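ESCALATION

Customer reports they have been waiting on this structure for their group meeting. Please prioritize. Original submission:
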Amino acid sequence: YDDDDDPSSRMVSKGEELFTGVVPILAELDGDVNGHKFSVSGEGEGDATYGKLTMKFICTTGKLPVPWPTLVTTLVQCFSRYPDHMRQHDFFKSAMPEGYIQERTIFFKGDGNYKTRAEVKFEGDTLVNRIELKGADFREDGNILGHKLVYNMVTEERLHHQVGQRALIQAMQISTMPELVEAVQKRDLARIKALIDPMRSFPDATYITVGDASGQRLYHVNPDEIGKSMVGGDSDEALINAKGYVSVRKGSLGSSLRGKSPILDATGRVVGIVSVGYTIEQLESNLVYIKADKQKNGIKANFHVRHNIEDGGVQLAYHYQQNTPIGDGPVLLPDNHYLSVQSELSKDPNEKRDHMVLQEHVTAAGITL
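Update from on-call: job pushed to the front of the queue and completed.
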């Protein structure tokens, strides 16, 4: 029965507690790219409770025939920091200590593709992740086999045309919802919240804020800021002139790129404003959009990364990721969310072999509860 048996107790969220504390990491990767064979091996520590990890990789066969930035994504998502209000969504630790396998396909726009089969298991009390990468149909004089990429990482860039267009469309579309303009006008916080929480369905923008005609917040991601007044001083141009714009200013959440747009009734008076924003922090970050998978019991993940080519522009890399657990123990399949990565490519001043020193910060955000 429910008393004749597991340890744990009596305050956690899963047996995946191996990561409280700094955990040793070990990883190899057997690589083939259009014939060019090579292999990488890396040591380093990883402290999931701070989301950070530092590692050093070494190409044990000679000169690495591809750019080091191209292998950063395939060379330990266990070490993401899921906050205590999201720890019921860490599918990566869920598979520990039994482990999960991690298969990914990486399309380099204008060139070839990486196809990686990996498994992140445990060995003793040290984390292991051995990969087999296969690269197909790469232009020999291309940016990858021609080593024409910069040694940064890298990434989401830059200034900020794409998401600015995206942030404003989200704002205006929300502010023309017919039930929303009736909602704001009656100051129905309940109906306002029930119309907007389904917005943040798959998380993307950091916040969606709705003000009344006086800038008083009627909806905010942090609920103890409802009824407070929006911060930034860049919402008169919407609340007074009924025109919608992009703006960069410091709100309750720090520096913020936000698209603002008025809410109009049938007359054309502005009854309020919506503000969709992205933190300047999260805009300088790589975001891995992961959703749960029932047919395979696991997750899928979609994201892309830019690779600044030196002397040129950008070589984009589109990633399609899918994870399946090794041991078919119990589950932990998460609702829609993402992880924000910040990584830095260094060099060991005393190593001479072709290598890479990677410091990486990853945080789980998307659900505000």
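Sent to customer with the following note: The chain is about 10% helix and 40% strand.
Escalation resolved.
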